[PDB]
Design a protein around this ligand. Sequence first.
Ligand code: HEM
Ligand SMILES: CC1(C)[C@@H]2CC[C@@]1(C)C(=O)C2
Ligand SMILES: [K+]
Length: 405
Amino acid sequence: NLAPLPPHVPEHLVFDFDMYNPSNLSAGVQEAWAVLQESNVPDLVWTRCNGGHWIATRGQLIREAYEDYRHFSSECPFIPREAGEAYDFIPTSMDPPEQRQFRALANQVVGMPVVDKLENRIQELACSLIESLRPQGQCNFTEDYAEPFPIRIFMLLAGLPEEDIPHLKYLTDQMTRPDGSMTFAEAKEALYDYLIPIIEQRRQKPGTDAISIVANGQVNGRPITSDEAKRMCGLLLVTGLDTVVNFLSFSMEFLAKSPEHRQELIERPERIPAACEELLRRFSLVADGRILTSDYEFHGVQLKKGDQILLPQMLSGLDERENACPMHVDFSRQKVSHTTFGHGSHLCLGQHLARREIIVTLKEWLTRIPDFSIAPGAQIQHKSGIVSGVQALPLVWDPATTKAV
Ligand code: HEM
Ligand SMILES: CC1(C)[C@@H]2CC[C@@]1(C)C(=O)C2
Ligand SMILES: [K+]
């Protein structure tokens, strides 16, 4: 329902948007959120949904807030408030200066140097997965590629058994798009229940995997603690199992519906990197936020200490103030403005791995299956939350138009 309106919030700024079930979801999740950018909606609004919280609707305010960590703290980054309070992953739940020291360590397992260590396996997996599907002329993209590709790469990197994916994927989804069976706190507890023993084992008998590296790592010259390691590894699981997985489906859904855009990349493959960037803007999918550390007047609005504010990374690039004709996909768009990977000191550290997985997927897919479409009569459904996604994506194609490599 709707939580009572705090006395410091003026009635004209109330817009009851539900980030976990937006009213215009049928038109597409990005379109659902874009309602916040209509001519009749203020730059900053208050929603009584999910306990009550502010929402910045424009790239300008979103960027500004992510830059000002003194006023907008990451200590409580998720909505509902109970989820934000329970959230303690590292380095995301910390503000500078303390946060910085952990970014260096994290970068050792998800940064550019880790992309080169797995460059070959990434290539091989994408090709093998796609070739296996090619002759079928059909597939359920979400489960047949979107999930297995990024997830298997992560599990390999982290040295975890593939048979554990179903369980880990369930827990992760409860922290971003809960089905109601588990509170964030419960999902977090379960994730740690899984990680604690593995961290202890890899600290006594270190390995070359991501978990061993973090567990036996150093932060600004001193040994990382078991607790810190646990909180960092938790974030790695979540980013490994619920980020690229969702973005790939949005991208393929669009490509299946746009023969002209597929054609463009087939005739001009060198434009794939640029197309990846434009797709990251058009189909941005993350939305978390911060908590006010004190009373603060922001753009004429009085924010009270403790107030939660959602700063949708998704909205910056969809904002027409940032990009003309924002809902249109233009691979030749001049300045692709967006905050899909975040903004401020918490800028995504795994963006190099993400882009590689995306670019490799587009290249190797169009190479083998250049002509495909959404299954006849199929109605694609999306889902909204901290990270948005696609429920299912049935694709079809004529095997005769495919090429085996
Ligand atoms: C398209 C895929 C991805 C998107 C859209 C994405 C987006 C983001 C965003 C929005 C943030 C900042 C959140 C905040 O400020 O509270 C972030 C942080 C982070 N991401 Fe990504 N991410 C993606 C993939 C990944 C992957 C694959 C990894 C790991 C290999 C990863 C690792 C991280 C880490 C470690 C942080 C936390 C950095 C910090 O808090 O200092 N991300 N990501
Ligand atoms: C908001 C995010 C996308 C960012 C990385 C995974 C995520 C869900 C977090 O908890 C941090
Ligand atoms: K917290």
